[PDB]
Amino acid sequence: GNPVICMGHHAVANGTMVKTLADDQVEVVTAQELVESQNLPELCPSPLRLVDGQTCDIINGALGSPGCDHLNGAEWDVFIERPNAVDTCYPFDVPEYQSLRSILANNGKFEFIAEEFQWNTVKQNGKSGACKRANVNDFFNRLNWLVKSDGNAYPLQNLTKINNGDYARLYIWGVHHPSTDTEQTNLYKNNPGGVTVSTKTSQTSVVPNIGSRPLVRGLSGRVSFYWTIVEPGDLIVFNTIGNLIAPRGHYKLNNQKKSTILNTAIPIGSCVSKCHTDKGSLSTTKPFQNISRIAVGDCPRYVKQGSLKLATGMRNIPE
Amino acid sequence: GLFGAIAGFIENGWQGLIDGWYGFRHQNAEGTGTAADLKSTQAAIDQINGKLNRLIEKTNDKYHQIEKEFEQVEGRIQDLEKYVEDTKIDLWSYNAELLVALENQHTIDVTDSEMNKLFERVRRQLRENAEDKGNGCFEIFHKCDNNCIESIRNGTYDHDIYRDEAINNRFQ
Numbered sequence: 064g065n066p067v068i069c070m071g072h073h074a075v076a077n078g079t080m081v082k083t084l085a086d087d088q089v090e091v092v093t094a095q096e097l098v099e100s101q102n103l104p105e106l107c108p109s110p111l112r113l114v115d116g117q118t119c120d121i122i123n124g125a126l127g128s129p130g131c132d133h134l135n136g137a138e139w140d141v142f143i144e145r146p147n148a149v150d151t152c153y154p155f156d157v158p159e160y161q162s163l164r165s166i167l168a169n170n171g172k173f174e175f176i177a178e179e180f181q182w183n184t185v186k187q188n189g190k191s192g193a194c195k196r197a198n199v200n201d202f203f204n205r206l207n208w209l210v211k212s213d214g215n216a217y218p219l220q221n222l223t224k225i226n227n228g229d230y231a232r233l234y235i236w237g238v239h240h241p242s243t244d245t246e247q248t249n250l251y252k253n254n255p256g257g258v259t260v261s262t263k264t265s266q267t268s269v270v271p272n273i274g275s276r277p278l279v280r281g282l283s284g285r286v287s288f289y290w291t292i293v294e295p296g297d298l299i300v301f302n303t304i305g306n307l308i309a310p311r312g313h314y315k316l317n318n319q320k321k322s323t324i325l326n327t328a329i330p331i332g333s334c335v336s337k338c339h340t341d342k343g344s345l346s347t348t349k350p351f352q353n354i355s356r357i358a359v360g361d362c363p364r365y366v367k368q369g370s371l372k373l374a375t376g377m378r379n380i381p382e
Numbered sequence: 383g384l385f386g387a388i389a390g391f392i393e394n395g396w397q398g399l400i401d402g403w404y405g406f407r408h409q410n411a412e413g414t415g416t417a418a419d420l421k422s423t424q425a426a427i428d429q430i431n432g433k434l435n436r437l438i439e440k441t442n443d444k445y446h447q448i449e450k451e452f453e454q455v456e457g458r459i460q461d462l463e464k465y466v467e468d469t470k471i472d473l474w475s476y477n478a479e480l481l482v483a484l485e486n487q488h489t490i491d492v493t494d495s496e497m498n499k500l501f502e503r504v505r506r507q508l509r510e511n512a513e514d515k516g517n518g519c520f521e522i523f524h525k526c527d528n529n530c531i532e533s534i535r536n537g538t539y540d541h542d543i544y545r546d547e548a549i550n551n552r553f554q
């Protein structure tokens with residue numbers, strides 16, 4: 064009585080190290096990396112609709128600056144906003160800049176609707192040598208520079224637009240700031256000027272402010288942009304005794320806003336992926352990624368660790 | 383692991399065992415052999431792939447979030463935005479660290495377990511015809527040719543055939 068039968072298990076020559084609760088280097092036969100640490104050097108145009116702002120950031124695209132024409136009609140899941148975008152128009156600011164940019168990005172589309180504003184006696188379509196469109200003095204094609212009549216008259220403006228549609232409207236307007244008391248009068252005669260936009264449930268009043276400012280592409284003057292949202296059943300009143308950069312109309316707002324914006328220099332390529340970081344798209348099935356906290360789409364969760372190995376086999380004890 | 387079979391009373395694994403995770407190595411009068419055990423191999427593979435599948439897809443489908451990079455400090459609101467995100471990241475990193483440690487601890491116990499279940503299965507087949515040598519091997523106290531060995535491996539071994547021979551070899 065002398066035959067022998069032995070029960071055993073496999074082994075390989077060199078396994079992979081993993082962590083347990085007790086040990087941070089246990090060798091197992093196979094393991095699987097759970098942290099994606101490689102990204103593609105491009106952004107995937109599919110399956111998500113990506114829209115490239117190119118030379119325009121999303122605020123300039125909303126305003127209608129020169130060169131931003133490709134963004135008209137544009138619809139996006141993710142707006143790709145380039146770091147080297149540049150102002151090509153009248154020097155401006157938006158007091159609540161990030162809140163406006165957020166609203167535009169999230170809304171997911173540039174659908175402009177023209178309206179005619181019957182401005183009494185004032186001149187319209189005022190242009191500027193800071194906003195050249197093929198060397199011709201121009202302006203934000205969504206805005207209307209109103210100045211004096213030639214008879215030196217800027218009277219009180221008083222027009223109302225009623226929203227009876229089935230969607231909420233976004234109106235973007237502005238207030239012009241001259242650099243001396245002279246300019247104020249050679250543009251809007253009155254001094255001071257002032258704009259007051261109101262709805263049934265809200266209102267906003269602006270004082271123009273006049274003084275010396277740094278030279279931005281040849282000028283000291285500025286425009287301050289504001290926005291008003293007009294729900295179904297509400298309506299909007301524009302009142303002006305001077306300095307109004309009037310709107311050409313209103314942007315359409317989706318009831319459900321599901322889009323966003325990604326700021327990056329990464330080029331848009333040909334790959335397929337539903338996950339985008341500011342470093343490029345991720346093409347992965349791993350549950351975690353260490354590439355960027357800035358991530359949009361259907362993505363692994365961002366973590367600090369560069370590697371987390373899951374054991375997919377038993378301890379490796381070769382020989 | 384908890385059962386003390388792998389890296390335990392089984393001294394090491396078999397690099398030659400390439401078509402299974404677990405198996406049988408024997409010696410009898412006509413020679414030696416190594417064969418994979420399918421059932422125990424499959425039981426371990428199923429449990430581990432099960433872990434992989436539950437893992438390789440929950441869902442984190444996120445679009446409009448918050449700004450996470452800033453050129454210049456702004457004060458109160460920016461501090462909160464940074465602190466929310468930093469808090470989220472630490473918590474998810476913690477989750478990821480713990481998950482892998484828990485999964486790996488368990489995976490090692492599962493595979494140690496399946497090794498022990500196989501040993502115990504064969505032990506029970508043999509009844510009084512064999513004795514545990516202490517290293518994952520049974521000494522079989524009767525002649526056991528290649529068909530006998532295969533009958534052990536495929537679960538058709540009938541201990542009553544050899545019991546008289548085995549008992550006599552064990553105790554005298």
Ligand SMILES: *[C@@H]1O[C@H](CO)[C@@H](O)[C@H](O)[C@H]1NC(C)=O
Nearest residue numbers: 219220221222223224300301
């Ligand atoms: C115009 O303003 C006057 C007062 O200045 C007010 O009574 C009137 O309702 C306003 N109408 C519109 C259409 O804004």
Ligand SMILES: *[C@@H]1O[C@H](CO)[C@@H](O)[C@H](O)[C@H]1NC(C)=O
Nearest residue numbers: 100353354355367368369370
């Ligand atoms: C991510 O992890 C890899 C190692 O897996 C490391 O080389 C890389 O530097 C990490 N990235 C960051 C941003 O920490």
